[PDB]
Amino acid sequence: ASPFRLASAGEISEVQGILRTAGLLGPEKRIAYLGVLDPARGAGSEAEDRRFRVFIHDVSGARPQEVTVSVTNGTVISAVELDTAATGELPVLEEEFEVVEQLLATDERWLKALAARNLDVSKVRVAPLSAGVFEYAEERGRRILRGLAFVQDFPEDSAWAHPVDGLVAYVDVVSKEVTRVIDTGVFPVPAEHGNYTDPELTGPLRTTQKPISITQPEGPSFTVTGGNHIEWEKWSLDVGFDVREGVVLHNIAFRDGDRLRPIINRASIAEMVVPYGDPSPIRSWQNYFDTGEYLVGQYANSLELGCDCLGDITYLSPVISDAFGNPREIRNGICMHEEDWGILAKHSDLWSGINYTRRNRRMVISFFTTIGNYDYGFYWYLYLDGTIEFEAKATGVVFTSAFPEGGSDNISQLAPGLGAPFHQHIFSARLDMAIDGFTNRVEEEDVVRQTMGPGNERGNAFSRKRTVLTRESEAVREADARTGRTWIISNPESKNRLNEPVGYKLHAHNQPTLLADPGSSIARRAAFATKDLWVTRYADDERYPTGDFVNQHSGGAGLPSYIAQDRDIDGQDIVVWHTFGLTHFPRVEDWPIMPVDTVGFKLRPEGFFDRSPVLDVPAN
Template sequence: MTLQTTPSTPLVQAPPVLATLVQAAAQHPLEQLSAEEIHEARRILAEAGLVGESTRFAYLGLIEPPKTARQGDVTGAARLVRAMLWDAARSRSLDVRLSLATGLVVDRRELNPEADGQLPVLLEEFGIIEDILAEDPQWNAALTARGLTPAQVRVAPLSAGVFEYGNEEGKRLLRGLGFRQDHPADHPWAHPIDGLVAFVDVENRRVNHLIDDGPVPVPEVNGNYTDPAVRGELRTDLLPIEITQPEGPSFTLEGNHLSWAGWDLRVGFDAREGLVLHQLHHSHKGRRRPVVHRASISEMVVPYGDPSPYRSWQNYFDSGEYLVGRDANSLRLGCDCLGDITYMSPVVADDFGNPRTIENGICIHEEDVGILWKHTDEWAGSDEVRRNRRLVVSFFTTVGNYDYGFYWYLYLDGTIEFEAKATGIVFTAALPDKDYAYASEIAPGLGAPYHQHLFSARLDMMIDGDANRVEELDLVRLPKGPGNPHGNAFTQKRTLLARESEAVRDADGAKGRVWHISNPDSLNHLGHPVGYTLYPEGNPTLAMADDSSIASRAAFARHHLWVTRHAEEERYAAGDFVNQHPGGAGLPAYVAQDRDIDGQDLVVWHSFGLTHFPRPEDWPIMPVDTTGFTLKPHGFFDENPTLNVPSSAAGHCGTGSEREHAAPGGTAVGHSGPDTGGQGHCGH
């Protein structure tokens, strides 16, 4: 990765040959692919006769060294690359592995599209679908009947899924819904063209099927949220907030190795998964201990709940079909990230196998998050308070109408948290009537179908080593009786999840259900296994019928928890090839082996997400909605590990006249140091 700290002078790049030599001399095997390595991978594939004019790169990424090979000094280990190649001229999908060290292809497999599915959607295909439809007589006739021309219509390139429509097996498909765009800066999501959908064979460049039920009035609302006529006058009552760290941030970043407040890890990035955190360790009282070997969001799916023939097929795997990492944004200081920011600029391959740098694609910073701990004790005469802070590693991606932020948080007390931030524009439709059961009216005549945003976190646990286990912890209410005369007693029940078949579980808010991940071979000073507890939000799982196509393809989202024995090839919750896969891949196939997971090297998969019944307030652009999970140390430390956090610097939490003023009504308002002020402008 390319590293840039902002604000700073841009780094001077070494000449390509020198840069390659320097990198080769010190490269860690988990350093992400460089532009030079992507060029080299493409060259190797071309020399092997696998790249021609019609070849496109659906995915290219690093094959990480096996977990067992990463424990010692493996600097300079052979670098392997995985490439997924689509050749439209030959109607061929290849899954290829190659060695950068030997310059040779080490493995290749041709996919059977009916059994294996298709490779991910290409960026090139976003435009191809519009080109195909612009030349299709049926599509043009449908637009003419609506008083439209192809030049006025944008077509959303939507993954097809697998359904019982005719003449689709084995074909590379997209489905297209149209939106009228009134001028180049117009947001077409305000003007859905309903009653019309095209099923497009992008491989053979033809329309496979068209559903046209006749013209439906196109909503005429204005969705241009920056238009003064829509937004109104800008507010003038928001004073600046300025985040400053005069001595710089508390973390260090060397290559992709990040260290902060006892934490150290390696920051990775993948075109499919986006951010990947490797080798999370925590050091306390001179002891460095592993916690999580690899953490990523392995999949996310957005299924829609409208059964109309125009939308009943809508479900999008934003990771496996669209590659959230490839679609990552370049971030701007003061807008996307605020404060003393360090950026990383990952490099991905484009459709032609050439490197593309996502400038400032990863944001790293620390932020104040309120009180860490506090107590005023009259008996001891003490009054102590400590401020909390967290390290934030994040990126943002745009997949069609939606934008997602992926935020990993590390805390001073050893807590790990993930938060997804969903924003952007809700998918729209012309509302059939105000009482339509499957969509919300968000503006006059404009509907937003009900849908979900469901994620799967893959947590390759390594709490004090590989021997880990998972127990389910439930609150148990006890009835009145001889041992509970006042009826106030409650306790906690522990259930060991010993095999994969036993570890497909759902959250239960009524029982306060959590899952404790521990190492039975490592005991704390109380004699209990050290561990971490996974706290789920417990939001709804996949809402679709159990025998639906999407339930088979997104089976991971049917349950909140899955636990599997570690296997290098089991990387994705919905399987390797998601696009048009018939279903059953991923977690259902993994757990079918029913392996022993008690005291084993295991992977915890956590499904979580949002069920979205859109509101009028979500239009014309949606305020951020959040979902996520928390991993908290539970017996991992012998006591509160933040007792050594110093109190705030002198003068930063005082009560002198320079630190406070009286608000209306006489309430004292304090200003606690340099983390207040104003940063109102986006920088670069």
């Protein structure tokens, strides 16, 4: 009954039929994106209308279309033709990946480059990568993929151990022609294998680990109703799934006594970009927008009990559309469980003689995606004390290159002749805030140092200051770890019992933001990644920090365009966009498969409650 329920296989089947009957899904057509639309702002909206947004690609070269359909009523609501030279190309299709390697295998320049290196074309894998926008005027309005080559010595070999440096090709995947083959010179192909399941590399496996058994003899403490509505330890929320963003959290609220108090209306990772910092022309164009260009939800893993998710696990199995409109289930794609989290609060009081200890726990909602060589885990945590936390876990196989003789300022050496270019992994969290309702504002809080003198005779005082962000043009903020900078989202119309506005404080990790030169193509296309915090006024169509069509868009779409409207954000319906990322200088220990590294952020209550919200937790 809930408007926020997961899409059904039946709903996707109905969408396919509606498109077919309307003549919009012929054999030349491919679905590049399909997702359910959130309800519009409407406090009391009772007329159920499930609407789906669809991007339709044409493999014969005709213009693509953006279509909105109503599954409840069985109608096409709107359909507009897209001019991709203006507004960007559609996301990359899974079936276009294979086309790159196939096309190059018959191209005479590619074959001659391989022949010079004595490489058998049947053993050469091509990574099909997004193109971006650079100097090639012939690419405007065409769907281009770029390919980099790796050698697979046998079918189970890790091709990432054998990059073929000095060689790159550009491919038009619609007209199926190879537009350029660039060969800058012969580099030795690294010869060591990177097969992390080969006993000759692992050695004998350890026999020293004894089992850790985590069970819940009475079952978990959370309930799941209506498919995806969660109730756990005073928290209430809906777990959504979108093929572009992955797991999305809706209607995060906390039951404070008798009232359900809203906190966040919608939480998602709305973009993630992986820019590479190697100036070689073989790779200097390389920037993955894993969310915007590839769609991270469509590559979600099926998660295995006891290996990926340990404990008493409740799974969700989201349904997405394939390229022809058929429903596809991602079995066990989302893990949900609770975890012990150590001590919550503890005090042994000499004067009262009371000894008090309580334990903490967290609710975990997670999924894992694989995009080529990289694998990313997305984890949302809810804690007993009101804290909300997100954590990204990065693993997989690092992207490789040759390691040049004489060294490099932009590439790490992992093995003899084997390099790994410097890169970043930068995420954008979109937090549609609803702190006790929709009238919210953001304050920037800095520590204030005070000088020794009158009123501070011993020179010990320090303080803090808060600055209200009142318009969008002043709501593009940078971190300052030295001054302990945080941001507070408050509701000026809802006060706690001390007559202070209720709030939540965002604690950032204060990692470096985008390092590229401000005049670069990537700085224009991923402008969100150049600043730590953005605040916008809510609008239905301002969904992604990079715009709707990221692939081969020339730049400026998304947050810079939104912010330019300079709207009032002082006690309004607002959206917080937080940039956070990992700067990765690969180390030898990252090879041949990388141990997890993590980055994230958290939000903590700041005068939201009238006292600690965990006084009613029992001892057990």
